[PDB]
Amino acid sequence: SLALSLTADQMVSALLDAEPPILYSEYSMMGLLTNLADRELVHMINWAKRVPGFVDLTSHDQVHLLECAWLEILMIGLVWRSMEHPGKLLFAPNLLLDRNQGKCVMVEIFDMLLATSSRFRMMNLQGEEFVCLKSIILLNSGVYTFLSSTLKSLEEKDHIHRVLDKITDTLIHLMAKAGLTLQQQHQRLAQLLLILSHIRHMSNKGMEHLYVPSYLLLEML
Amino acid sequence: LSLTADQMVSALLDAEPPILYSEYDPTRPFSEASMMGLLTNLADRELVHMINWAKRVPGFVDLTSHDQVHLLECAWLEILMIGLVWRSMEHPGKLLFAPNLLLDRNQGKCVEGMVEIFDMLLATSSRFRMMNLQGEEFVCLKSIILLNSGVYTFTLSLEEKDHIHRVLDKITDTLIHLMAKAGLTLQQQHQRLAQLLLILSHIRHMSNKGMEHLYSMSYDLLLEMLDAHRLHA
Numbered sequence: 001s002l003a004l005s006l007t008a009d010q011m012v013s014a015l016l017d018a019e020p021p022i023l024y025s026e027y028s029m030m031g032l033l034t035n036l037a038d039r040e041l042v043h044m045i046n047w048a049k050r051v052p053g054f055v056d057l058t059s060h061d062q063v064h065l066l067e068c069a070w071l072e073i074l075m076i077g078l079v080w081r082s083m084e085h086p087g088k089l090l091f092a093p094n095l096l097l098d099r100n101q102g103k104c105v106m107v108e109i110f111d112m113l114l115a116t117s118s119r120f121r122m123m124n125l126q127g128e129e130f131v132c133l134k135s136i137i138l139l140n141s142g143v144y145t146f147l148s149s150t151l152k153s154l155e156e157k158d159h160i161h162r163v164l165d166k167i168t169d170t171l172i173h174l175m176a177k178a179g180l181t182l183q184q185q186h187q188r189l190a191q192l193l194l195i196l197s198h199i200r201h202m203s204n205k206g207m208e209h210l211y212v213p214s215y216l217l218l219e220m221l
Numbered sequence: 222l223s224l225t226a227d228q229m230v231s232a233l234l235d236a237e238p239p240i241l242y243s244e245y246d247p248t249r250p251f252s253e254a255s256m257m258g259l260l261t262n263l264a265d266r267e268l269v270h271m272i273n274w275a276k277r278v279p280g281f282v283d284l285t286s287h288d289q290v291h292l293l294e295c296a297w298l299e300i301l302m303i304g305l306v307w308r309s310m311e312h313p314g315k316l317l318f319a320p321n322l323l324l325d326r327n328q329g330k331c332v333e334g335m336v337e338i339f340d341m342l343l344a345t346s347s348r349f350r351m352m353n354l355q356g357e358e359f360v361c362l363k364s365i366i367l368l369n370s371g372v373y374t375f376t377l378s379l380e381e382k383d384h385i386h387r388v389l390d391k392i393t394d395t396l397i398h399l400m401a402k403a404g405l406t407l408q409q410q411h412q413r414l415a416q417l418l419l420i421l422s423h424i425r426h427m428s429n430k431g432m433e434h435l436y437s438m439s440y441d442l443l444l445e446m447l448d449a450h451r452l453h454a
């Protein structure tokens with residue numbers, strides 16, 4: 001696989017190059033957010049195909065990872081955009097919401113997204129770290145619920161775990177490079193991966209409130 | 222907070238709760254109601270021991286009573302589930318709820334929506350077996366779930382969060398120490414730390430799905446039990 005041969009610096013360059021653009025909301029809250037999310041999803045599919053290791057998977061496994069990860073990926077993008085806007089969520093440059101506007105439908109999810117944004121600000125999360133985390137969410141979120149037990153599904157799981165190890169090495173490289181001690185490198189890697197557990201929780205609560213792209217995702221692939 | 226990695230391991234190993242038995246001789250085969258009854262009874266007894274264990278996790282009693290209950294409210298089902306997965310590791314294809322309650326996949330079907338959670342728990346047990354998860358690593362992970370699960374959903378609140386993040390950094394140092402001691406290279410140490418923490422995201426998912434399936438078919442209880450824990454001889 002090409003992925004497993006990349007250095008830390010090449011993995012970061014590939015992921016930075018694959019970054020989708022920040023979209024605007026069209027010139028009702030759910031309507032505006034659905035329209036924005038629908039446009040972001042088309043870019044997310046094309047971004048996913050550029051994450052090293054992702055296109056080495058079967059179509060079926062690519063769709064499963066996207067089905068499991070799509071809301072977590074929208075949410076980490078939102079939190080990243082909102083970082084320099086304490087108390088607000090920057091859905092788009094023309095759709096900056098504060099807590100009060102959560103009340104429209106959602107306030108609980110808003111509060112959890114605001115807390116994540118604060119955590120990233122407090123940690124001084126870097127763009128190189130952000131693109132690594134977003135790639136981890138894509139590969140990790142669905143890896144434990146692959147249904148099959150064929151030789152091919154075992155090889156797919158193994159491949160995903162190897163790419164996840166490459167992204168871990170990349171995060172450690174970025175931290176070493178910034179001059180963190182070995183202890184600081186391991187502590188910061190832990191703090192970043194522990195935030196992924198909160199993003200999973202926010203995604204699940206989001207869906208609970210709602211009750212979505214179907215296994216739609218295949219055609220789009 | 223001033224402890225060594227070696228002392229952190231000793232404290233966590235020493236604080237481990239006991240393994241409980243299921244209610245003896247229930248009517249077998251099970252119905253939906255009688256399985257849910259057995260599991261509710263076991264979980265209710267395990268909760269008393271979880272509170273006692275939580276009070277011995279370094280840093281936990283430094284929090285306010287309100288913040289202790291908030292962490293337990295957020296973490297209790299994840300903690301029951303990682304204990305189940307740990308007990309089940311030496312029983313491929315089965316979940317060891319108790320030494321006298323070993324279930325295979327098919328029994329999950331008795332309760333609607335439970336077979337999906339069973340399958341996810343069996344996959345986690347396989348992942349731990351494949352990684353050769355060690356007891357000293359398991360007690361570290363269980364402590365991380367307690368301190369991490371509720372920390373982001375708690376005001377000069379800021380001091381409590383800072384304290385929890387420092388204790389979490391101490392448990393990370395402890396995990397790395399255990400891996401170093403075992404003879405893993407620096408690369409292997411960081412990869413294994415990442416693989417263990419990435420499984421916590423799947424345990425969170427299983428916990429959320431568990432609750433969703435329940436409501437398809439708490440703070441106050443935990444506060445009384447925590448309050449009452451101060452009155453225990």
Ligand SMILES: O=S(=O)([C@@H]1C[C@@H]2O[C@H]1C(c1ccc(O)cc1)=C2c1ccc(O)cc1)N(CC(F)(F)F)c1ccc(OCCCN2CCCCC2)cc1
Pocket residue numbers: 257260261262263264265267297298301302304305318332333334335336338339427430431432433434435439440442443
């Ligand atoms: O997620 S489960 O599969 C869940 C996993 C496994 O099996 C179920 C079960 C369990 C746990 C607790 C029980 O009371 C009964 C059963 C397990 C277990 C038991 C002992 C273990 O050592 C390890 C695991 N599940 C059912 C579904 F899948 F069918 F939907 C489910 C059931 C009940 C739930 O909460 C009940 C509210 C109780 N509160 C009330 C407020 C105060 C705090 C307590 C949440 C989810």
Ligand SMILES: [Cl-]
Pocket residue numbers: 023024039
């Ligand atoms: Cl657009």
